[PDB]
Tab-separated table of N, CA and C in Angstrom:
chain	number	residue	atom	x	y	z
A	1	UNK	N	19.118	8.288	-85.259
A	1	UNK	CA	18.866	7.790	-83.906
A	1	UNK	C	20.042	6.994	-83.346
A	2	UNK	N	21.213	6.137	-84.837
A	2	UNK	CA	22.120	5.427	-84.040
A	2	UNK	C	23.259	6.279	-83.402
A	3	UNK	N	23.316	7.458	-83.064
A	3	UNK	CA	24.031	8.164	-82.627
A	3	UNK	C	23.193	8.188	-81.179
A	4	UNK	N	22.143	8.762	-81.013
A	4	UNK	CA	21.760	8.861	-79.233
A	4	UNK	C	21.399	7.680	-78.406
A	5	UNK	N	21.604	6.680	-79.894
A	5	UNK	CA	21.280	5.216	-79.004
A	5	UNK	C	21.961	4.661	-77.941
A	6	UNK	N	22.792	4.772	-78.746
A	6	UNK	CA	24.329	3.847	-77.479
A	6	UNK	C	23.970	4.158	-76.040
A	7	UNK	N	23.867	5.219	-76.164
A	7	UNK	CA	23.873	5.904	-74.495
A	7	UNK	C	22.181	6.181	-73.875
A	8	UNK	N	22.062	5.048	-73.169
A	8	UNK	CA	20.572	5.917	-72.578
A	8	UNK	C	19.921	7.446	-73.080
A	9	UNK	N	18.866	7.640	-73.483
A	9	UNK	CA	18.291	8.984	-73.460
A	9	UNK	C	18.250	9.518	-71.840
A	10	UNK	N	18.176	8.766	-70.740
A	10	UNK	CA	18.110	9.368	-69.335
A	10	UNK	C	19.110	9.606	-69.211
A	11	UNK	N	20.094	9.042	-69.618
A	11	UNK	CA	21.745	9.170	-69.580
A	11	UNK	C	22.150	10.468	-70.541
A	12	UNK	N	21.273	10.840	-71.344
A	12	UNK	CA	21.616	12.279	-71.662
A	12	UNK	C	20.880	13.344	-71.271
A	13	UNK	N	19.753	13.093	-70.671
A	13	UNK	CA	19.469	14.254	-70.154
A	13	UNK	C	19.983	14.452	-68.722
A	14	UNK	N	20.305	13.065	-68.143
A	14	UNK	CA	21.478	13.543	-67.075
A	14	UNK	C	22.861	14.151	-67.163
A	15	UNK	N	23.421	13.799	-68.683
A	15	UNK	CA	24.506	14.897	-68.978
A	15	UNK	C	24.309	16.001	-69.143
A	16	UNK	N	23.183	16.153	-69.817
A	16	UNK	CA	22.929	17.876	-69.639
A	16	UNK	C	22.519	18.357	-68.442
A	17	UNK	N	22.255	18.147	-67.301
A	17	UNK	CA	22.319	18.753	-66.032
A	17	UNK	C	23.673	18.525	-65.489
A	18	UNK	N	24.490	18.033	-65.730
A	18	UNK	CA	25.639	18.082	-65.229
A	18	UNK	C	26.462	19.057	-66.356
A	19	UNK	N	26.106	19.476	-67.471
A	19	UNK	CA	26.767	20.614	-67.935
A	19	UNK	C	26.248	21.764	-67.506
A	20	UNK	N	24.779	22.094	-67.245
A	20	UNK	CA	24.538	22.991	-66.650
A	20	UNK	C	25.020	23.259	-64.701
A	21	UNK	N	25.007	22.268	-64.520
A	21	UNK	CA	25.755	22.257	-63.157
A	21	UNK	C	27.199	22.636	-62.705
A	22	UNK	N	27.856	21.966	-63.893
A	22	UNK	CA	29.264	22.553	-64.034
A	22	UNK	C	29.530	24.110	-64.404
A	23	UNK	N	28.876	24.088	-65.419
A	23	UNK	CA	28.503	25.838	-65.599
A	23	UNK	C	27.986	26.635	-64.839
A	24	UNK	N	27.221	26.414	-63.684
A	24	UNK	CA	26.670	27.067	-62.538
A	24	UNK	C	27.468	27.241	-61.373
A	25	UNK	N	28.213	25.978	-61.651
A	25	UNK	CA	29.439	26.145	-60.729
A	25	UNK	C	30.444	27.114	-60.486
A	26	UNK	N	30.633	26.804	-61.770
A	26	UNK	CA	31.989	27.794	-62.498
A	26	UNK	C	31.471	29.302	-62.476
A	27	UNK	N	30.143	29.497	-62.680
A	27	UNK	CA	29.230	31.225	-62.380
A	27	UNK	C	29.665	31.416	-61.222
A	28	UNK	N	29.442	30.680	-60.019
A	28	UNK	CA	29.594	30.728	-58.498
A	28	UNK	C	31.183	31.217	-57.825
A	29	UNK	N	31.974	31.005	-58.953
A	29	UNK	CA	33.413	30.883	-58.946
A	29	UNK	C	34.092	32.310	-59.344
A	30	UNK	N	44.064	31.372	-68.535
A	30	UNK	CA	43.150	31.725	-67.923
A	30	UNK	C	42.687	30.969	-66.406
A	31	UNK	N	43.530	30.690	-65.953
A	31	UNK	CA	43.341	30.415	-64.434
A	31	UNK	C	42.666	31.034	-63.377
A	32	UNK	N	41.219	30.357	-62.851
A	32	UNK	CA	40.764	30.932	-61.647
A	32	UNK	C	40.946	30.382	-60.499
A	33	UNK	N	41.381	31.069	-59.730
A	33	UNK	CA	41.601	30.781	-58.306
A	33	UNK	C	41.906	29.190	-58.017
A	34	UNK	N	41.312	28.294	-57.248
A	34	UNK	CA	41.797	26.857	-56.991
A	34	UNK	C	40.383	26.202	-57.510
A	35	UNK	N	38.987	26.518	-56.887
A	35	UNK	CA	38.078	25.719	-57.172
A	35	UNK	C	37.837	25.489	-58.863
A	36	UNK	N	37.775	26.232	-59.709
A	36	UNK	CA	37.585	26.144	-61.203
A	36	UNK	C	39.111	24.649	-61.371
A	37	UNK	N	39.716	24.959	-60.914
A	37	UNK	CA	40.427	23.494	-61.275
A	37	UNK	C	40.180	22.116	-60.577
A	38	UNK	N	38.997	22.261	-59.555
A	38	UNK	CA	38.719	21.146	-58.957
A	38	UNK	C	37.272	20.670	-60.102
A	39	UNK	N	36.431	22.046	-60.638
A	39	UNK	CA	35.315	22.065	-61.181
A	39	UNK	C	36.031	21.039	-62.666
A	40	UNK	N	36.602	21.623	-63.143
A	40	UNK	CA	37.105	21.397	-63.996
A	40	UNK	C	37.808	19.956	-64.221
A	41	UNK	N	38.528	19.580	-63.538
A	41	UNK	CA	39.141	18.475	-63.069
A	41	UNK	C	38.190	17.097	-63.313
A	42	UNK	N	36.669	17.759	-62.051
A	42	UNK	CA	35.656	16.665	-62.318
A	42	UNK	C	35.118	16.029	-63.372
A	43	UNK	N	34.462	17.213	-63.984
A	43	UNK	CA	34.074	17.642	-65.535
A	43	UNK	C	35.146	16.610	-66.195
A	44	UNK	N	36.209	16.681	-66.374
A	44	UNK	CA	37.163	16.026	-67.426
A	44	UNK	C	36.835	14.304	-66.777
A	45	UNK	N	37.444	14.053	-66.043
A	45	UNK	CA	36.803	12.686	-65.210
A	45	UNK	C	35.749	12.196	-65.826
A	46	UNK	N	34.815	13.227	-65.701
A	46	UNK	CA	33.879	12.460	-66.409
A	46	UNK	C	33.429	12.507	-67.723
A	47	UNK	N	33.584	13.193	-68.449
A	47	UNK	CA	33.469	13.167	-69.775
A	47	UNK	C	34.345	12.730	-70.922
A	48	UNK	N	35.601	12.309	-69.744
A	48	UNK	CA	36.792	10.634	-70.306
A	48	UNK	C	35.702	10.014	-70.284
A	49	UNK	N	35.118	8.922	-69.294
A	49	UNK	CA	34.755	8.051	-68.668
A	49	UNK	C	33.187	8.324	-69.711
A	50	UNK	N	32.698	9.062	-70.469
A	50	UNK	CA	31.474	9.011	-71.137
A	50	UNK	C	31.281	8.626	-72.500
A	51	UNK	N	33.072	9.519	-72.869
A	51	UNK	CA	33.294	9.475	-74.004
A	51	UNK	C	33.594	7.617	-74.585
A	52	UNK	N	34.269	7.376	-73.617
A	52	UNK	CA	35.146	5.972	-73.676
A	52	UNK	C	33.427	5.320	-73.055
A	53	UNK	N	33.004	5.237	-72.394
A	53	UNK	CA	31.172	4.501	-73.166
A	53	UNK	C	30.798	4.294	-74.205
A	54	UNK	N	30.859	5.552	-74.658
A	54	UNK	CA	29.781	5.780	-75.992
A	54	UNK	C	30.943	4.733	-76.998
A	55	UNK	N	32.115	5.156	-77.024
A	55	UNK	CA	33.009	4.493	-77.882
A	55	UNK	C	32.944	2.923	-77.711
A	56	UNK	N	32.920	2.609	-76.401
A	56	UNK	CA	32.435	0.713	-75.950
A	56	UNK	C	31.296	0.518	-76.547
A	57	UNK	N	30.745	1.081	-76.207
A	57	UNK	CA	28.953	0.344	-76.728
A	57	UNK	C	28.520	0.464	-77.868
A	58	UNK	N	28.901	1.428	-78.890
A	58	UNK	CA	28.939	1.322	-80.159
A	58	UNK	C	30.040	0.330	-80.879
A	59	UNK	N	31.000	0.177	-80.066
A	59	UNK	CA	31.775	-0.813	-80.932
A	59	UNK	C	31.595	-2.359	-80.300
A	60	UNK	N	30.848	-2.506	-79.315
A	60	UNK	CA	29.704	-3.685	-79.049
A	60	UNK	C	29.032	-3.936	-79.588
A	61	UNK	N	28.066	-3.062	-80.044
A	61	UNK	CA	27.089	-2.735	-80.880
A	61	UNK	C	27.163	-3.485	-82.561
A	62	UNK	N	28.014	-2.796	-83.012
A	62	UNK	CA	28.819	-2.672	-84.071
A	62	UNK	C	29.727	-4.159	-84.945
A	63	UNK	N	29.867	-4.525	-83.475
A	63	UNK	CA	30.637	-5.903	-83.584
A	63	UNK	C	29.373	-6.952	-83.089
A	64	UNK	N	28.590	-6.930	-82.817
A	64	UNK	CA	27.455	-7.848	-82.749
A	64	UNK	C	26.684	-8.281	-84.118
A	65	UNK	N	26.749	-6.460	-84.916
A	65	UNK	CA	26.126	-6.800	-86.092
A	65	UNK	C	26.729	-7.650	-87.030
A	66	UNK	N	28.381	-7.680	-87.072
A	66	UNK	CA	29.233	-8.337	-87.854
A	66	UNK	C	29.642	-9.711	-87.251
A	67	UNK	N	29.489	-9.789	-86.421
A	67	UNK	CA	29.249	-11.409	-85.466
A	67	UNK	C	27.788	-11.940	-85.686
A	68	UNK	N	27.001	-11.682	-86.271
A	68	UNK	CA	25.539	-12.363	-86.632
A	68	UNK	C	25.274	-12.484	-88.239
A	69	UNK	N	25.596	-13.625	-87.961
A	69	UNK	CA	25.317	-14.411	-89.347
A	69	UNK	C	23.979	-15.073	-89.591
A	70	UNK	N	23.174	-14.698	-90.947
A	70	UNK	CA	22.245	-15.368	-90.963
A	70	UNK	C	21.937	-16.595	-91.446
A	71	UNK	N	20.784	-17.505	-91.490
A	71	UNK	CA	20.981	-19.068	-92.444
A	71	UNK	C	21.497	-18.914	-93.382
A	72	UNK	N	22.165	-20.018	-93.775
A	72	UNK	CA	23.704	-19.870	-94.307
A	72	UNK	C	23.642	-21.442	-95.085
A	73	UNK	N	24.513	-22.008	-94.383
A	73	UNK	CA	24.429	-23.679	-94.249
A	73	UNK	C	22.752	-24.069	-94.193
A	74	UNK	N	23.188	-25.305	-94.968
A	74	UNK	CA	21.522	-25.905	-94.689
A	74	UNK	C	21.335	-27.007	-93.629
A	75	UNK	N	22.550	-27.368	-92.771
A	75	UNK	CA	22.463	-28.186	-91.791
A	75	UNK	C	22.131	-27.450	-90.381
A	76	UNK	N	22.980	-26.202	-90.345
A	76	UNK	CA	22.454	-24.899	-89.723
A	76	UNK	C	21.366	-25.062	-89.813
A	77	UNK	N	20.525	-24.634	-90.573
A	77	UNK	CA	18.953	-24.286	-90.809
A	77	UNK	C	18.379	-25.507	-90.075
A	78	UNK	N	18.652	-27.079	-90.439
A	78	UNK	CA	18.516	-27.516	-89.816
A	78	UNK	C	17.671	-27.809	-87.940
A	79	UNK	N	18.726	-27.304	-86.923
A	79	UNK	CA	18.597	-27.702	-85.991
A	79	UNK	C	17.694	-26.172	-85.863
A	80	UNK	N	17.277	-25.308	-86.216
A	80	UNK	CA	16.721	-24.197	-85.650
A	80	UNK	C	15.186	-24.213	-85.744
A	81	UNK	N	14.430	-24.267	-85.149
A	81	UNK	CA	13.336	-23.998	-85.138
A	81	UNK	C	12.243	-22.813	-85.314
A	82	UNK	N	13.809	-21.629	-85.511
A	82	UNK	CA	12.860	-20.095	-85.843
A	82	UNK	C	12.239	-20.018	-87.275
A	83	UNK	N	13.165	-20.038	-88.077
A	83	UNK	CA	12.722	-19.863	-89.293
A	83	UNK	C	11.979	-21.432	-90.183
A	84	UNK	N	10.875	-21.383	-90.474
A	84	UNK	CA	10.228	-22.336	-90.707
A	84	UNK	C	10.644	-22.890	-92.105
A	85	UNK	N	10.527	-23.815	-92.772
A	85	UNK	CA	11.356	-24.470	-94.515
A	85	UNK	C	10.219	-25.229	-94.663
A	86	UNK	N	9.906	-25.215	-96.221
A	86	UNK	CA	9.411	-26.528	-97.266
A	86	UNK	C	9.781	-26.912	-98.543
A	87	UNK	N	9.162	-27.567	-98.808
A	87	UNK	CA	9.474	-27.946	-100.294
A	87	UNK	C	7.813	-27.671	-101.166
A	88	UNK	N	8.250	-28.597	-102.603
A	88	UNK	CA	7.064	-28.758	-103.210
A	88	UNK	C	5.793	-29.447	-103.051
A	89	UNK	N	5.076	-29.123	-103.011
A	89	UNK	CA	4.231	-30.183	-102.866
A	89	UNK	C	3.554	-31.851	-103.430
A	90	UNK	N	4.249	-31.863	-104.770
A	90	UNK	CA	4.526	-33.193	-105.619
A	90	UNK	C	5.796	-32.581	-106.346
A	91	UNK	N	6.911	-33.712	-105.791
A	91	UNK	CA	8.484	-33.504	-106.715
A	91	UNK	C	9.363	-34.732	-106.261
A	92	UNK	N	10.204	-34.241	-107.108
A	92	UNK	CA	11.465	-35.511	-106.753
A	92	UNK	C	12.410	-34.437	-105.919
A	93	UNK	N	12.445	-33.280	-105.004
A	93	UNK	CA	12.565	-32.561	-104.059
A	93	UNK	C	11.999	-33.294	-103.034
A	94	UNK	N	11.069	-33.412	-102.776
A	94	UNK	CA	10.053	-33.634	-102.147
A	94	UNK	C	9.832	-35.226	-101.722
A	95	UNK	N	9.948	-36.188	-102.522
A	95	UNK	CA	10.484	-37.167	-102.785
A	95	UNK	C	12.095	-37.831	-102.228
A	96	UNK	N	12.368	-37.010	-102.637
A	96	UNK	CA	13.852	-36.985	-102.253
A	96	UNK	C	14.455	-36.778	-100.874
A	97	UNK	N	13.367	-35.657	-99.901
A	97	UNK	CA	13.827	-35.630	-98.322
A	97	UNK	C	13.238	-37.000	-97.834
A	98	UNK	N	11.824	-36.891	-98.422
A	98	UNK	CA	11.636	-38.202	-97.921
A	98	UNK	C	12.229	-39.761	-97.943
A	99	UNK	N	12.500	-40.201	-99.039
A	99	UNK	CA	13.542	-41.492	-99.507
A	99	UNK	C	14.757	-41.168	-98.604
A	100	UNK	N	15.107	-40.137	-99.031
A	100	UNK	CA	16.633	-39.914	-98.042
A	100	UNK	C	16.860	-40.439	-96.551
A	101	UNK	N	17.438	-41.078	-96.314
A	101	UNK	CA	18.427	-41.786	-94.340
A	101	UNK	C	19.052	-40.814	-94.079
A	102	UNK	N	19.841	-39.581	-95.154
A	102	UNK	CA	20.549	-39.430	-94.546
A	102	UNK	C	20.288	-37.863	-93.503
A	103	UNK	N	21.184	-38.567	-92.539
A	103	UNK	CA	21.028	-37.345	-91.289
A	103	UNK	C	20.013	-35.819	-91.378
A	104	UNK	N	20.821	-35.396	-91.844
A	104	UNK	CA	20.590	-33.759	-91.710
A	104	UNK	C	19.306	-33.822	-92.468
A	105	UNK	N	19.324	-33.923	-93.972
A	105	UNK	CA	17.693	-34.169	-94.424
A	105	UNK	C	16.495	-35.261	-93.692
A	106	UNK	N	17.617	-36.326	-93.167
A	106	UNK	CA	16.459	-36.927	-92.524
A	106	UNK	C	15.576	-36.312	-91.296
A	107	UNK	N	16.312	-35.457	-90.588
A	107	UNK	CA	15.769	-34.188	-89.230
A	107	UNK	C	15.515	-33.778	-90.263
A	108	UNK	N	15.420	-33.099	-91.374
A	108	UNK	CA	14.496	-31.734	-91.506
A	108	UNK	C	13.118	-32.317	-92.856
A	109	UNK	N	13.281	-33.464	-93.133
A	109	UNK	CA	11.885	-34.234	-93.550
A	109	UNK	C	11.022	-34.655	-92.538
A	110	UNK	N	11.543	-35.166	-91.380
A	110	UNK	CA	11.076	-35.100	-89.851
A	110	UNK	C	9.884	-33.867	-89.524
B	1	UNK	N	16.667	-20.651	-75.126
B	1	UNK	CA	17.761	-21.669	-75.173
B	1	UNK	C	18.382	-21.951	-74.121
B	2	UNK	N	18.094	-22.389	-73.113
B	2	UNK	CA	18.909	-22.544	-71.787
B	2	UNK	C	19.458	-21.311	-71.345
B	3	UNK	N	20.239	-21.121	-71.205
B	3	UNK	CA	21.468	-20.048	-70.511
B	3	UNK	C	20.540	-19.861	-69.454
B	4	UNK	N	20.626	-4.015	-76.482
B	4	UNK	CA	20.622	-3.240	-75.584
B	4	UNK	C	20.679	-1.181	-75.734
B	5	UNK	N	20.937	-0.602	-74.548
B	5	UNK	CA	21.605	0.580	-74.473
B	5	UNK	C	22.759	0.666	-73.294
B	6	UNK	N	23.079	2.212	-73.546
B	6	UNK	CA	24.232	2.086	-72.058
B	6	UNK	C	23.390	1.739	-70.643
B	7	UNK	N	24.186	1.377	-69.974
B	7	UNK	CA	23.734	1.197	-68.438
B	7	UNK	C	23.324	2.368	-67.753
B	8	UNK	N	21.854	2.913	-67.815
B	8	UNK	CA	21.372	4.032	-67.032
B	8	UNK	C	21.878	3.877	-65.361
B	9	UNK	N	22.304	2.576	-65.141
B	9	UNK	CA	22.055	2.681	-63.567
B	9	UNK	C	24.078	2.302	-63.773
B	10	UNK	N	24.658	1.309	-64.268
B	10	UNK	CA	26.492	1.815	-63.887
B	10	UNK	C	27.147	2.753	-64.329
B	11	UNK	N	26.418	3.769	-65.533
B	11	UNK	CA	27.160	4.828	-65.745
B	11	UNK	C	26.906	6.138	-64.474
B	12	UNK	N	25.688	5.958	-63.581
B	12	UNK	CA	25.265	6.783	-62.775
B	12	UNK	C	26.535	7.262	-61.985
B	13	UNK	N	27.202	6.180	-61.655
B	13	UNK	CA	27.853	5.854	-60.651
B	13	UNK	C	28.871	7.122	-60.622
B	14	UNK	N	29.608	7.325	-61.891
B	14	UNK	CA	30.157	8.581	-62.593
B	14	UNK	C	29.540	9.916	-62.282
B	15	UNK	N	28.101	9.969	-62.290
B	15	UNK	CA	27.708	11.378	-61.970
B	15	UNK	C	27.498	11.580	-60.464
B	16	UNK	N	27.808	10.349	-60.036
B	16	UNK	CA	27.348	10.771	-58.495
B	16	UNK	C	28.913	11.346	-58.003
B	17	UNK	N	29.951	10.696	-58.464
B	17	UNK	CA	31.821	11.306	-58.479
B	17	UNK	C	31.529	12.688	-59.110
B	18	UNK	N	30.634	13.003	-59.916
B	18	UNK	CA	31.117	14.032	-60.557
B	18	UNK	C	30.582	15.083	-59.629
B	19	UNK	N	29.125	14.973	-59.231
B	19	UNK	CA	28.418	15.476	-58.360
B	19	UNK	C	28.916	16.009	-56.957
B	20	UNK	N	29.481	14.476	-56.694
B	20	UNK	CA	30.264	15.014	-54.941
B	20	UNK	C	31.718	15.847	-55.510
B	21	UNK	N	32.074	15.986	-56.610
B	21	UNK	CA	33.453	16.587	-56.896
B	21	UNK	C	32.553	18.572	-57.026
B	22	UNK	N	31.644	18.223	-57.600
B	22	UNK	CA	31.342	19.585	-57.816
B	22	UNK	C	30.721	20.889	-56.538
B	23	UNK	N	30.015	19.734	-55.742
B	23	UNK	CA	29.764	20.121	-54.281
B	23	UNK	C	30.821	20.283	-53.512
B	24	UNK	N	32.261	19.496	-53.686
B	24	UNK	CA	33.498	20.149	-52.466
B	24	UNK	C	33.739	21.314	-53.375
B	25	UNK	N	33.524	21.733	-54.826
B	25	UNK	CA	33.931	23.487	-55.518
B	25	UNK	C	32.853	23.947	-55.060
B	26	UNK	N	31.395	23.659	-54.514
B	26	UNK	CA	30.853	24.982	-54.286
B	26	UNK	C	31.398	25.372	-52.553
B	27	UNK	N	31.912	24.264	-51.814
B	27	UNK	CA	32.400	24.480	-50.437
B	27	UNK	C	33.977	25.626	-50.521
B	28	UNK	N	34.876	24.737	-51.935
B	28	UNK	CA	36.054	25.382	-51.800
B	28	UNK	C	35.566	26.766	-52.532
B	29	UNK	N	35.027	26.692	-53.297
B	29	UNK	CA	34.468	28.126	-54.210
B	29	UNK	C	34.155	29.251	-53.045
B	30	UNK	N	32.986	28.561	-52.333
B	30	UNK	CA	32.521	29.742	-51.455
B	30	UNK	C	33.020	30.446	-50.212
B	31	UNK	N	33.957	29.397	-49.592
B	31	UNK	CA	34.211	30.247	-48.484
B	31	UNK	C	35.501	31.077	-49.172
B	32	UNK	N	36.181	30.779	-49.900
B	32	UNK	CA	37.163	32.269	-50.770
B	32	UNK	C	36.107	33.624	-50.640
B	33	UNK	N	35.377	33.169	-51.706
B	33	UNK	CA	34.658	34.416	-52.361
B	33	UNK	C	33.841	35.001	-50.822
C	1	UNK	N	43.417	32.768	-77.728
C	1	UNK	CA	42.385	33.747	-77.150
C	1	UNK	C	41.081	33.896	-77.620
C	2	UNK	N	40.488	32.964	-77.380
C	2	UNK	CA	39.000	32.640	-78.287
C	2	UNK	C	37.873	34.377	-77.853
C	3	UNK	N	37.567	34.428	-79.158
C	3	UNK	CA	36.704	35.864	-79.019
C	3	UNK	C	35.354	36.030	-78.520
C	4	UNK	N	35.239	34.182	-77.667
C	4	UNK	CA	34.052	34.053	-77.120
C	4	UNK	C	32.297	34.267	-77.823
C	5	UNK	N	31.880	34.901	-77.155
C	5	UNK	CA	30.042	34.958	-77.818
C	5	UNK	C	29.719	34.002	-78.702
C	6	UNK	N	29.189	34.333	-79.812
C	6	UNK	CA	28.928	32.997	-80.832
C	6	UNK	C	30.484	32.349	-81.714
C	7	UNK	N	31.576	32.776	-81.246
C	7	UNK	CA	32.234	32.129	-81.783
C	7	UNK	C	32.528	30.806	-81.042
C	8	UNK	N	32.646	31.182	-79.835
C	8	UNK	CA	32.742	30.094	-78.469
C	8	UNK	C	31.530	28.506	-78.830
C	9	UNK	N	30.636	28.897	-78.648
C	9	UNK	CA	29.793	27.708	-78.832
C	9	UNK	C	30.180	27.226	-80.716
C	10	UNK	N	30.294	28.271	-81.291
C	10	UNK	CA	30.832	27.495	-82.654
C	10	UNK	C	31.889	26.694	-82.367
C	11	UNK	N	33.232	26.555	-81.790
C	11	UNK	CA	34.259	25.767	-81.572
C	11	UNK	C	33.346	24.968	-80.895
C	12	UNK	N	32.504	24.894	-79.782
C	12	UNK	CA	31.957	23.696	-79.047
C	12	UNK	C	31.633	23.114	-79.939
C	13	UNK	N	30.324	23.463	-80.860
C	13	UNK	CA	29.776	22.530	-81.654
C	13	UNK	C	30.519	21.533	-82.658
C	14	UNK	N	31.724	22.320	-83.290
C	14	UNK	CA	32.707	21.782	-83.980
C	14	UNK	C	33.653	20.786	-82.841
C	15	UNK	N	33.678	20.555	-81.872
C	15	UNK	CA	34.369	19.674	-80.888
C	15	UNK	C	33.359	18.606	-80.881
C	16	UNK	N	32.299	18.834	-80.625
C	16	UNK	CA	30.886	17.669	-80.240
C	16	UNK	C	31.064	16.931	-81.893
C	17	UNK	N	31.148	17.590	-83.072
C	17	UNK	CA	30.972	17.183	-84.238
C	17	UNK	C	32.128	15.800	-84.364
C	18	UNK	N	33.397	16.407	-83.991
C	18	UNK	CA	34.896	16.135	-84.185
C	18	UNK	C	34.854	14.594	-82.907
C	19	UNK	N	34.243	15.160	-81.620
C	19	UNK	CA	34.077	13.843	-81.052
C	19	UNK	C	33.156	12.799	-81.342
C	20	UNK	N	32.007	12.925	-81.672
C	20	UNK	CA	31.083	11.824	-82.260
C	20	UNK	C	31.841	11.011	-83.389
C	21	UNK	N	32.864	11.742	-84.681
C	21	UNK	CA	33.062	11.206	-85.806
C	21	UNK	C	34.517	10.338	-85.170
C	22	UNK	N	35.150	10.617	-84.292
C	22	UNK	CA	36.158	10.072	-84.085
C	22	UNK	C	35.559	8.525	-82.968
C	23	UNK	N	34.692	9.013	-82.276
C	23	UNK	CA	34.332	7.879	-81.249
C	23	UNK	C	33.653	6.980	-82.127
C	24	UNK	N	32.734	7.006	-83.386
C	24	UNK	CA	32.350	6.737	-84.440
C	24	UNK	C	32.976	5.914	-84.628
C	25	UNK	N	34.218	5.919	-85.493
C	25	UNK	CA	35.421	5.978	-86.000
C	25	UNK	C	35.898	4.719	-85.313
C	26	UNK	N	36.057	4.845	-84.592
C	26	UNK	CA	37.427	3.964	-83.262
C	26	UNK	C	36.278	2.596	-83.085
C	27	UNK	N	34.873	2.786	-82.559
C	27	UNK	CA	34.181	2.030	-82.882
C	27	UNK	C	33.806	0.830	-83.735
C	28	UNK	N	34.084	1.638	-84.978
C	28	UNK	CA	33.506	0.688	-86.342
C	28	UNK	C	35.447	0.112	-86.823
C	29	UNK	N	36.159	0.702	-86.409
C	29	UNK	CA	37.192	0.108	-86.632
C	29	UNK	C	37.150	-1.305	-85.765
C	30	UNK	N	37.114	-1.407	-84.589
C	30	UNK	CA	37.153	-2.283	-83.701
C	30	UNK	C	36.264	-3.556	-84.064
C-alpha cells in the first residue's frame, strides 16, 4: 500500500484518465505532424511534475519516520502527558520518587 | 498543543495545464486532419 | 524500433517498475 500512498488514490485515478486522454488524443492525430508534439510535450510536463511528487512526499514521509523519536530520556517522559508511568506499589522505588525534591522526579511523583 | 497524502486539490492544478494543453491538440490536431 | 504489441506495454511496465524503484530510491536516500 506504501507505494499508492504517497499520492492520493483520486490522484490516480485522475492519472489514469489523463493517460487515456492523452492516448485518445494521439488516436485523433517517428514524428507526427505538429499536434503529437504539443500532445506529447503536455504529457511530459506533467508526468515531470508527478514524478517529482511522488519522490517529495515519500521522502517527507520517510524523513518524518526518522525524525520521530520515541520516549527515550526520562525527563522527556516527564513533561508528556500521552503515555501514562508508575512504579511499585510498596518499594524504595516508590519511596524514593516520593522522598525525592528533586525536579524532574519531583513532576513525575506529582 | 497550541500551534498525510499528496494534495488531491494542488496537484489538480497540473491536470487542469495538462488538460487545456491537450484541448489546443485536439483544435491543432483537427483542423489539419 | 520497438516491435510494438505485447512487447510495447512490456517496456512500459519495465519503465513504471524502473520509475517507482528509482523515485523509491532518491526518497529514502534523502
Amino acid at each position: 500500500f506504501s507505494f499508492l500512498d504517497p499520492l492520493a488514490y483520486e490522484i490516480w485515478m485522475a492519472i489514469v484518465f489523463a493517460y487515456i486522454l492523452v492516448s485518445v488524443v494521439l488516436f485523433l492525430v517517428s514524428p507526427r505532424s505538429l499536434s503529437a508534439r504539443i500532445v506529447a510535450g503536455v504529457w511530459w510536463f506533467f508526468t515531470l511534475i508527478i514524478i517529482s511528487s511522488y519522490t517529495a512526499n515519500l521522502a517527507a514521509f520517510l524523513t518524518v519516520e526518522r525524525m520521530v523519536s520515541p520516549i527515550e530520556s526520562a525527563e522527556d517522559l516527564s513533561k508528556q502527558t500521552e503515555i501514562a508511568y508508575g512504579t511499585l506499589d510498596s518499594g524504595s522505588t516508590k519511596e524514593f520518587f516520593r522522598r525525592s525534591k528533586i525536579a524532574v522526579f519531583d513532576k513525575m511523583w506529582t | 498543543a497550541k500551534d498525510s497524502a499528496l494534495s488531491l486539490s494542488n496537484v489538480a492544478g497540473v491536470f487542469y495545464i495538462l488538460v487545456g494543453g491537450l484541448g489546443l491538440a485536439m483544435l491543432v490536431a483537427l483542423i489539419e486532419f
